[PDB]
Amino acid sequence: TALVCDNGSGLVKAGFAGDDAPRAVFPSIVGRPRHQGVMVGMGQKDSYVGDEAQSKRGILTLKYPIEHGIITNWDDMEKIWHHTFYNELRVAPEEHPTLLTEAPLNPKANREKMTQIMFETFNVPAMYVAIQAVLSLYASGRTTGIVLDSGDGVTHNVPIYEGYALPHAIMRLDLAGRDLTDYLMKILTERGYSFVTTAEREIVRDIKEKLCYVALDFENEMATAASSSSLEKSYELPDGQVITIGNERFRCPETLFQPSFIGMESAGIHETTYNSIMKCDIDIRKDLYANNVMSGGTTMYPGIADRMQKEITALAPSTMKIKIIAPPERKYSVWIGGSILASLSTFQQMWITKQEYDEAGPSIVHRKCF
Amino acid sequence: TALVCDNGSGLVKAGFAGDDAPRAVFPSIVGRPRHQGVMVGMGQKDSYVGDEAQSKRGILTLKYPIEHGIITNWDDMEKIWHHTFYNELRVAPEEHPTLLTEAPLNPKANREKMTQIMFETFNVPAMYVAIQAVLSLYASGRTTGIVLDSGDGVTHNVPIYEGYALPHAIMRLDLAGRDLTDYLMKILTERGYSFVTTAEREIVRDIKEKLCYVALDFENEMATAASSSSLEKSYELPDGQVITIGNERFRCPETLFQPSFIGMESAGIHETTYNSIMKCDIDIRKDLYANNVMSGGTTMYPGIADRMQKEITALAPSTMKIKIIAPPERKYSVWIGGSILASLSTFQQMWITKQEYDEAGPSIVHRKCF
Amino acid sequence: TALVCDNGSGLVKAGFAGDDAPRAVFPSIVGRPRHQGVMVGMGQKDSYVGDEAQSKRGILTLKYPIEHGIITNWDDMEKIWHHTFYNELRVAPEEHPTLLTEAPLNPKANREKMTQIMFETFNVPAMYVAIQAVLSLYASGRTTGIVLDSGDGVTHNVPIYEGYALPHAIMRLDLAGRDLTDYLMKILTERGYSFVTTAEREIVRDIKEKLCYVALDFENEMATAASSSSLEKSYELPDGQVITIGNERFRCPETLFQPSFIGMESAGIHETTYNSIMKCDIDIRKDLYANNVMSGGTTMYPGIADRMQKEITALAPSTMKIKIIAPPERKYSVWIGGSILASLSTFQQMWITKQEYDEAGPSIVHRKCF
Amino acid sequence: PAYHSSFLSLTDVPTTGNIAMLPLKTKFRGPAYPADESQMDIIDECIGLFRANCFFRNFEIKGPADRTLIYGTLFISECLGRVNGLNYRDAERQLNSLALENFSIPGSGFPLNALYAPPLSPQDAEIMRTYLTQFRQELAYRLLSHVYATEKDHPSKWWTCFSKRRFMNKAL
């Protein structure tokens, strides 16, 4: 067995290769206390990690060590990996290879320090660093398609044909569920309700995860919510009081299809997918159009597969069929795909091994993992 | 063995660390004789303290040395500390490290002179000052909750969550047993009974201690007392004459809920407790409404927990559960909490020793204690 | 001619367009009596407003009808506007269009209820609701800048370039002159002075305005105040007694740079400025750092512009000038800006007219104003 | 061969579970009998051996003095795990708090529960806890005199780098 540790920017998703689904899913958060620690003894800790922080958050400054899929704070990222292996999986990491992941078009130094900490702190016996939108394509049961992965921090497209990636046609967009959370705070502020702190940012994430949905036709949905009760509904806070919301429920997800709302100049996710298909060689485009693959938690909004199929069918030539593949387990497909990969018998030849790291130094990942 | 001295506004409570209740409780009072004293030499003395002063009250001027939790006369206060050590506990203070209690939001000069007298005059080995609210959580055996403490001189709230106090959400209210005794000593004049002397203050206190109760619905108790004698009670004064009391018997404690009765603007104990919860972070409020810890001798009127639970249920959102926690030992729960704190094996490195007072003066107390 | 009326959380500031300074500058207060009122013919009235409430305060509870730039008490807010027009300005509102003000990121029910009161009750010919900061830039005689505005109830940044605002880089912080006043009421307790009534909040506000100043280097000013010296200064209360304060003079406004003094988990005004600039498009940052504009009464502490220049220079990259403009008229520069904007010969197309409100209802205010 | 305790040659020393309550030089309150102030008691041995014994990976236990030395050798690794970046004035207080916080005794959560005999009675558990708290308070205080030997505001890296090392791959 080998660990598969998809340290995403919003959730760590971890477990064992060939296991059905990730067994350690928790916030990619380190919390530190912000108040007068008056009661002596009491089992107090200098910092808290994951669900241990999320449940204590009313006294903590929660901060994610990872932003837009790039590690910003290594002293806390080691704290998350240590929590993953010793507290959440309860293994010794020196006994198991780890398949890690990262998004494409990351800094070189991210990939180096992430191999160095696995070999020099966690003492791991072998490791590998897969591209997240390649893994999501194993989890679809395919060898050609265009994975749209979108998580908490990054959205990216990787077009693949016959198992060859077309790396010139990879699109990264630094917009995903954390920007939709920050935008939901900016529009909730307009109805009556103020959310400000790093802990209140989790309450509005827990709104976004169950009140929001994607409108199939935003400009007509906007007129319908401005003229009826049916689109409005309510959520009950930790403080027992009720929050009622309406056109905020679909204006939030719409930022993915209209990044101009949060001040970005870019294509939306629909036109970013088409700009990746139209960068590919002309003979493969039909087999990409019939195999768009949704992945990552930001693709979980009710109606996003219907909307994505509508917007791509308007951009694509009407002569040919579009399919969006969106399984119900697309919430974890990058982990699911790493759990396939780390169990394929040729894969056991591809690991960076401890001995090979010791001899080659941390630059070995650049001449073995892609 | 350490001493715990809850040096309160109306009662001193004192005992050793790890005792289950105070070994001494007595009036926090010093007095001088009010008359010519012509028959000299039958054991008269220049001044009287504690139970001796209380026993001779009719021939005495009685001075409390503490006003609203601030020492207002230092000679009278060090006479009480001298009397605790050399009459009530009968121990060398220079062999017993001492734990002391204070209200939050207090003059820094009070804690300094209280420190100075302990090292300069009682020569104590080591000493500590605790904000008396958080001792009520030690006595209640809990890491979490909102204290309401009402003493003789001060009423104050402190939210604590999982061992951390919220020092911005703390608040205090200079209204408790003394001001209720002043108000009762006023309103008995509406029935034509009269009390004015520093001795008669204690007679009205001794009436307030047993006749008075908290109305669950003040307008109903007013309307019923205005139309029946069945709520009336009677009591006999030391001089031999007798009094009968009606609506005055609950209109007095109602001042805790309506401070405008004594001309104060700031709100009652229910409203200030709710505002102290609402001043906390949004997530912790669920656990604070479930842990309203009552404390201090003014929180002991019949019906006060039932009234407090009714009042806060009208303020808080009804889709959550609010409870008042009010043990039979309420009156001593500050001292009981100090006895627990002074017993903790982890606390024994927090006593401020004379061997770090010497090179720092009284000023050390603000950085070493709290 | 046009009226201009800044609905300040602490002072109403009102006048005609093209006047050089506001005609009316008075507290945003409604006062009510709290005493028996036995004196027939005392000149007493059922409620008090502005400077009549401020001068009569000894017998009153004082109610601010705005909290944090949001109207919390509409029935008393239309009493303030009625007092403003009919008593303070002595105008018929039917003869003058009104420019009103609102802070950014504000519950849009506030904006609707405000315009509804102007058209339904004051019958104002036409009106507008400017963003509170965009007026401040006009008064500076400027078109590129980052406006740091801070009043009695709200502090916010609007970065704006060539007359285009960046609405995604607008940042708001509900910390201002009242939060500093209430923190001063808290820390004045450490000397043993006490202030608790709403009338005493005004006395602490009157201390704050002339005793407090911003330390250039807070820890070094604390270490300088640790020896009694020219740091401490006297003030004389309405009671005729003197008080003295030391480092309470600069712990007072240091809360702007350290909101954790009032328990807020948010950046100070220096990092809120720098985070607003670092959210802006990379080319405009140089011109925003060169054109930072302060406004509102909380920007008037001695040394605050100097210490801001020092703090932004420590955050920003070191190659380039940083210039925080602090006008001497910045006490009123939002109203000065409104007096310019309502006077421009290009602006008369932008007023909401009574005739189009009578078609559209109050929702026209969003479609016209932002 | 790893380095065993000198005290395994000693006999008729008191015992709890099958720890040895070896003679101790200390100021802390507890049941350990006073050592000669001029002699290496088990804590000077345990600190002297720790930096060598945590590199070996095969350690036969001869008796109750080695069961005591192993608990010390494991608790040194907890202290060096704590101490990184502290001032000595903070490290004293942090490592006394570590020494005094509630811990599992052998026979209760304990890692080496296969090799240490549970307390013989409900009373034997208390004499064991009051010994092990006195032992590990003194062990923390003694260790700090070595790790902050030459400079008082930065733990010497020649001691701090064993914080990743882990006696026989066990820890508390």
Ligand SMILES: Nc1ncnc2c1ncn2[C@@H]1O[C@H](COP(=O)(O)OP(=O)(O)O)[C@@H](O)[C@H]1O
């Ligand atoms: N049901 C849902 N509806 C909308 N957003 C969701 C849903 N479930 C998860 N998310 C969002 O997905 C993000 C986490 O997705 P994930 O794929 O695990 O991201 P990452 O890999 O970067 O950690 C968070 O922003 C979360 O709120």
Ligand SMILES: Nc1ncnc2c1ncn2[C@@H]1O[C@H](COP(=O)(O)OP(=O)(O)O)[C@@H](O)[C@H]1O
């Ligand atoms: N059973 C009681 N019910 C109501 N008031 C009481 C009762 N017993 C004592 N008191 C009041 O308790 C107050 C003393 O409370 P305490 O906590 O000891 O105050 P302190 O600590 O500040 O001296 C006195 O004012 C006294 O009148």
Ligand SMILES: Nc1ncnc2c1ncn2[C@@H]1O[C@H](COP(=O)(O)OP(=O)(O)O)[C@@H](O)[C@H]1O
């Ligand atoms: N000289 C000053 N120094 C510091 N603070 C001041 C000064 N003058 C006024 N203030 C404070 O600024 C606030 C009023 O500012 P203002 O711009 O009028 O706010 P608002 O527009 O929101 O009503 C009050 O808290 C007031 O006490």
Ligand code: BEF
């Ligand atoms: F880091 Be997640 F994939 F956005």
Ligand code: BEF
């Ligand atoms: F001093 Be008591 F708490 F009023």
Ligand code: BEF
């Ligand atoms: F409302 Be003021 F601008 F704080």
Ligand SMILES: [Mg+2]
């Ligand atoms: Mg991801």
Ligand SMILES: [Mg+2]
């Ligand atoms: Mg008390």
Ligand SMILES: [Mg+2]
């Ligand atoms: Mg203002």
